[PDB]
Each structure stands twice: as C-alpha cells, then as structure tokens.
Amino acid sequence: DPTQFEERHLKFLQQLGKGNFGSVEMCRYDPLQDNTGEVVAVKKLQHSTEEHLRDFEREIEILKSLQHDNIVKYKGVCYSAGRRNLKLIMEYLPYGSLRDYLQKHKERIDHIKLLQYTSQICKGMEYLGTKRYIHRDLATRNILVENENRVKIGDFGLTKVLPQDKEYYKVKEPGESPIFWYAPESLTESKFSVASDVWSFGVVLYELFTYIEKSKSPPAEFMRMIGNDKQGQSIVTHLIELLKNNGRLPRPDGCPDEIYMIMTECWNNNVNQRPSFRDLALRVDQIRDNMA
Numbered sequence: 001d002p003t004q005f006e007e008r009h010l011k012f013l014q015q016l017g018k019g020n021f022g023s024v025e026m027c028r029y030d031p032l033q034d035n036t037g038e039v040v041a042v043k044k045l046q047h048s049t050e051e052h053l054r055d056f057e058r059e060i061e062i063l064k065s066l067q068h069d070n071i072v073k074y075k076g077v078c079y080s081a082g083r084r085n086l087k088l089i090m091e092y093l094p095y096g097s098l099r100d101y102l103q104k105h106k107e108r109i110d111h112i113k114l115l116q117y118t119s120q121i122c123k124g125m126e127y128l129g130t131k132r133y134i135h136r137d138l139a140t141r142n143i144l145v146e147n148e149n150r151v152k153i154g155d156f157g158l159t160k161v162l163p164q165d166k167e168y169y170k171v172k173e174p175g176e177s178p179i180f181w182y183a184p185e186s187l188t189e190s191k192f193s194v195a196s197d198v199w200s201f202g203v204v205l206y207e208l209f210t211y212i213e214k215s216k217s218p219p220a221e222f223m224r225m226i227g228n229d230k231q232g233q234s235i236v237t238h239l240i241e242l243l244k245n246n247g248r249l250p251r252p253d254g255c256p257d258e259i260y261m262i263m264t265e266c267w268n269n270n271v272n273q274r275p276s277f278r279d280l281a282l283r284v285d286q287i288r289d290n291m292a
C-alpha cells in the first residue's frame, strides 16, 4: 500500500537534477488534491529504452536493499500501464547536493564540519561494501544534504554488484564515465572494486577541502597537469600516464596535514595498499575527536 504510488497523484513541483539517462524531480504525492500531500524526490528515465529500463530496475532494487542513516531512503516505485515505465520514489533532502551546498557556504563550513560529512560518507560507503556493491560514481555532486548535521549518498545509477567469485566488476562497454574520479585500473582495464571506490573517496575528500573552488576542481587540475590541449580519447591516455608517474591532485590550500595524508593514501597505484572504509571512518573520527 504505502510503497505503491499512483502516477496521476504526483504533482510536479521543480527539477532537481539531470543525469546521463534520466532526471530527478521534486513532486508532491497528493491523492487528496488539496496540496497537503508528502513532498518526495522522483527519479525517471529521459530515454526509457529496454536496456535503460533493465539497468534502472537494478538501481531500484539496489536502493531498496540499503537501510543506513547516510544512504538516501527508498520510498517506492510507480508503474505506467503498457510499456511499464518506472519512477523511483525517494525521500526529498531539502538542502540539495553537497557540491552546491559547499560551493554556496564555502569556508563558513569549518574543518570540524567537513570531517563530520567525511565520516558520514565513509560509513555509508563501508555499509555499501558489506552488500558487495560498488558505487563507481562517488563525488560531492552525488552526495545530498539532509540538514547541516547529516549527508547521505545518492545516485546509485552506476552501481554494480560484485560477482560471487571475484573482488572486482569489469565494465565491458562503458557509457559516460567520471574519469577524473577514476582509479588507474578503472581507466586502463575498466575494473571496479571497493578499492576503486576508496580512490574516488580520496577525490571527494579533495573536493571538500577545496570548498568547490571552480579553478581547483579535479577536471580543471588534471587538465592543467596533462595539458589543456589534450582532447577526447587523448585525455584518458595522458591521464593514465600521469597517474602511473605519480602525478596527483595537489594539497588544497589550508588543508590539514593529517587529512591530505588520507587523500594521498587513497590515491595509491597499488590497489591492495589503499585503506579500508572501516579504517577510514575510525581515522576520521579520531581526527574529529583530537580537533574537539
């Protein structure tokens, strides 16, 4: 009954985000037509092909199986008659993405606060790992802000389930890929694992401590390091060679030494040497404790 949402009762309120394959809208589920209904986040496909609907149904099952304080809450699904188009209903987190929230308030969010968000992201990621899911798209644009004290991981659109017998998932024909957040083995061999999500987490830590200063973004900085003249496939070729030669994002201005050390450990070329999310949450909570 409650996880079953009638499409005719969903009132469009505003556009929240546009993705690779779909979009997120803020809607009011109002089966009384008196504007007293619940506000929800609705994800739908812009191009609802057979393949996209199959991947979207997988994302829906992934989200429904996760129950953690730092993972967006699944609410339900809408089904259309005939071709069976799907809408994913979720809780609406009113402060928007962490990227936009941090870009808006900048240094008004102190290091203690950025570390509280860091800890929350590690715990969400650690929990994800227990289900053998690989996020593949961890970035501040995919983290949502519930309120000043809580962030949650969103956009499971690229998420993969590890096979029973392997610790990595190989993507045979990649679609749009966030290469500036990718581990070297993800760029070279299209292999994704808990360890490549740890690499991404290091880029998220970098994002947080740059306060989303446009000129300092991972695409602007990697582009500067490989040369702005690089285009299309040549960018991937030069990024791989850069990472292999220990080219890395710089320390963000005013970033504490203990935090920058964590980023650099996440960015190890040796997959086995990268820290675990269980250890990261422990280390971050110790740093917050020392800071307090």
Ligand SMILES: COc1cc(-c2ccc(O)cc2)cc2cnc(Nc3cnn(C)c3)nc12
Residues within 6 Å of the ligand: 016, 017, 018, 024, 041, 043, 059, 063, 072, 090, 091, 092, 093, 094, 095, 096, 097, 144, 153, 154, 155, 156, 157
């Ligand atoms: C892209 O935005 C969102 C994405 C998802 C999402 C999508 C797919 C998925 O598997 C899991 C979560 C959920 C969202 C929930 N609440 C908001 N709120 C918001 C956004 N902007 N502003 C101003 C308030 N945004 C959300």
